[PDB]
Design a binder for this molecule. Sequence first.
Ligand SMILES: *[C@@H]1O[C@H](CO)[C@@H](O[C@@H]2O[C@H](CO)[C@@H](O[C@@H]3O[C@H](CO)[C@@H](O)[C@H](O)[C@@H]3O)[C@H](O)[C@H]2NC(C)=O)[C@H](O)[C@H]1NC(C)=O
Ligand code: NAG
Lengths: 50, 46
Amino acid sequence: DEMIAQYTSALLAGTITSGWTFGAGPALQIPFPMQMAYRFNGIGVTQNVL
Amino acid sequence: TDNTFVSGNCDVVIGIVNNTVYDPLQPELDSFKEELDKYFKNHTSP
Ligand SMILES: *[C@@H]1O[C@H](CO)[C@@H](O[C@@H]2O[C@H](CO)[C@@H](O[C@@H]3O[C@H](CO)[C@@H](O)[C@H](O)[C@@H]3O)[C@H](O)[C@H]2NC(C)=O)[C@H](O)[C@H]1NC(C)=O
Ligand SMILES: *[C@@H]1O[C@H](CO)[C@@H](O)[C@H](O)[C@H]1NC(C)=O
Protein backbone atom coordinates (compact mmCIF):
# COMPACT_ATOMS: atom_id res chain seq x y z
CA ASP A 1 0.00 0.00 0.00
CA GLU A 2 3.04 2.30 -0.10
CA MET A 3 4.15 1.57 -3.67
CA ILE A 4 0.53 1.94 -4.78
CA ALA A 5 0.59 5.33 -3.04
CA GLN A 6 3.82 6.06 -4.95
CA TYR A 7 2.32 5.40 -8.39
CA THR A 8 -0.75 7.56 -7.75
CA SER A 9 1.56 10.28 -6.41
CA ALA A 10 3.49 10.19 -9.70
CA LEU A 11 0.46 10.53 -11.96
CA LEU A 12 -0.48 13.67 -10.01
CA ALA A 13 3.06 15.01 -10.45
CA GLY A 14 2.96 14.77 -14.25
CA THR A 15 -0.63 15.73 -14.97
CA ILE A 16 0.03 19.04 -13.17
CA THR A 17 3.42 20.04 -14.58
CA SER A 18 3.50 18.26 -17.95
CA GLY A 19 -0.21 17.68 -18.61
CA TRP A 20 -0.95 14.85 -21.02
CA THR A 21 2.30 14.90 -23.01
CA PHE A 22 3.96 12.49 -20.57
CA GLY A 23 1.50 9.77 -21.58
CA ALA A 24 2.58 9.84 -25.24
CA GLY A 25 6.34 10.35 -25.18
CA PRO A 26 8.85 12.47 -23.31
CA ALA A 27 7.40 14.79 -20.67
CA LEU A 28 7.28 18.47 -21.67
CA GLN A 29 6.83 21.28 -19.15
CA ILE A 30 3.93 23.76 -19.28
CA PRO A 31 2.61 26.18 -16.61
CA PHE A 32 -0.68 25.12 -15.05
CA PRO A 33 -2.28 28.51 -15.69
CA MET A 34 -1.85 27.70 -19.40
CA GLN A 35 -2.55 23.96 -19.50
CA MET A 36 -6.06 24.75 -18.24
CA ALA A 37 -6.58 27.04 -21.24
CA TYR A 38 -5.91 24.06 -23.51
CA ARG A 39 -8.76 22.06 -21.96
CA PHE A 40 -11.27 24.80 -22.77
CA ASN A 41 -10.11 24.79 -26.39
CA GLY A 42 -11.17 21.13 -26.63
CA ILE A 43 -14.69 21.91 -25.41
CA GLY A 44 -15.98 24.60 -27.76
CA VAL A 45 -15.23 27.82 -25.89
CA THR A 46 -12.22 29.95 -26.75
CA GLN A 47 -9.22 30.90 -24.63
CA ASN A 48 -10.50 34.31 -23.55
CA VAL A 49 -13.10 32.86 -21.19
CA LEU A 50 -10.27 31.74 -18.86
CA THR B 1 -2.85 39.39 -37.35
CA ASP B 2 -3.70 36.16 -39.20
CA ASN B 3 -2.25 34.10 -36.33
CA THR B 4 -3.90 36.13 -33.54
CA PHE B 5 -7.41 37.13 -32.51
CA VAL B 6 -8.07 40.17 -30.31
CA SER B 7 -10.22 40.06 -27.17
CA GLY B 8 -10.75 43.15 -25.03
CA ASN B 9 -8.37 45.23 -22.95
CA CYS B 10 -4.97 44.04 -21.74
CA ASP B 11 -5.16 44.59 -17.97
CA VAL B 12 -7.34 41.75 -16.63
CA VAL B 13 -5.03 38.98 -17.86
CA ILE B 14 -2.07 38.11 -15.62
CA GLY B 15 1.36 37.39 -17.10
CA ILE B 16 0.97 39.43 -20.30
CA VAL B 17 4.13 40.74 -21.97
CA ASN B 18 4.60 43.79 -24.17
CA ASN B 19 5.71 43.27 -27.77
CA THR B 20 4.62 44.21 -31.30
CA VAL B 21 2.14 42.50 -33.63
CA TYR B 22 2.34 43.25 -37.35
CA ASP B 23 -0.35 43.44 -40.03
CA PRO B 24 -0.04 42.32 -43.67
CA LEU B 25 -2.23 44.99 -45.31
CA GLN B 26 0.01 47.89 -44.28
CA PRO B 27 3.11 46.80 -46.31
CA GLU B 28 0.87 46.45 -49.39
CA LEU B 29 0.24 50.21 -49.39
CA ASP B 30 3.86 50.86 -48.37
CA SER B 31 5.05 50.49 -51.98
CA PHE B 32 2.85 53.45 -53.04
CA LYS B 33 3.91 55.91 -50.33
CA GLU B 34 7.48 55.71 -51.65
CA GLU B 35 6.19 56.07 -55.21
CA LEU B 36 4.25 59.28 -54.52
CA ASP B 37 7.10 60.84 -52.51
CA LYS B 38 9.21 61.77 -55.55
CA TYR B 39 6.44 63.65 -57.36
CA PHE B 40 5.92 66.02 -54.42
CA LYS B 41 9.41 67.53 -54.81
CA ASN B 42 8.81 68.14 -58.54
CA HIS B 43 5.92 70.58 -57.94
CA THR B 44 6.86 72.56 -54.83
CA SER B 45 10.37 73.48 -56.02
CA PRO B 46 9.45 75.35 -59.20
C1 LIG C 1 4.54 48.04 -22.56
O1 LIG C 1 5.91 47.87 -22.22
C2 LIG C 1 6.36 48.79 -21.21
C3 LIG C 1 7.84 48.55 -21.04
O2 LIG C 1 8.19 47.20 -21.31
C4 LIG C 1 5.56 48.61 -19.92
O3 LIG C 1 5.87 49.69 -19.05
C5 LIG C 1 6.41 49.26 -17.77
O4 LIG C 1 6.20 47.85 -17.51
C6 LIG C 1 6.78 47.41 -16.28
C7 LIG C 1 6.55 45.92 -16.20
O5 LIG C 1 7.37 45.32 -15.21
C8 LIG C 1 6.18 48.18 -15.09
O6 LIG C 1 6.87 47.80 -13.91
C9 LIG C 1 5.94 47.46 -12.86
O7 LIG C 1 5.72 48.58 -12.01
C10 LIG C 1 4.79 48.34 -10.93
C11 LIG C 1 4.55 49.66 -10.21
O8 LIG C 1 5.81 50.19 -9.83
C12 LIG C 1 5.38 47.26 -10.02
O9 LIG C 1 4.49 46.98 -8.95
C13 LIG C 1 5.65 45.97 -10.83
O10 LIG C 1 6.23 44.98 -10.00
C14 LIG C 1 6.50 46.25 -12.08
O11 LIG C 1 7.82 46.52 -11.62
C15 LIG C 1 6.31 49.68 -15.31
O12 LIG C 1 5.61 50.39 -14.29
C16 LIG C 1 5.75 50.09 -16.67
N1 LIG C 1 5.94 51.51 -16.90
C17 LIG C 1 5.00 52.29 -17.44
C18 LIG C 1 5.36 53.73 -17.61
O13 LIG C 1 3.91 51.85 -17.79
C19 LIG C 1 4.05 48.63 -20.18
O14 LIG C 1 3.35 48.23 -19.01
C20 LIG C 1 3.67 47.72 -21.35
N2 LIG C 1 2.26 47.86 -21.67
C21 LIG C 1 1.31 47.11 -21.11
C22 LIG C 1 -0.09 47.39 -21.56
O15 LIG C 1 1.57 46.25 -20.28
C1 NAG D 1 10.11 66.25 -62.92
O1 NAG D 1 9.66 67.33 -63.76
C2 NAG D 1 10.42 67.49 -64.96
C3 NAG D 1 9.87 68.72 -65.66
O2 NAG D 1 10.91 69.50 -66.23
C4 NAG D 1 10.32 66.23 -65.81
O3 NAG D 1 11.14 66.38 -66.97
C5 NAG D 1 10.77 65.02 -65.01
O4 NAG D 1 10.55 63.83 -65.76
C6 NAG D 1 10.00 64.93 -63.69
N1 NAG D 1 10.48 63.82 -62.89
C7 NAG D 1 9.67 63.01 -62.20
C8 NAG D 1 10.34 61.91 -61.42
O5 NAG D 1 8.45 63.15 -62.20
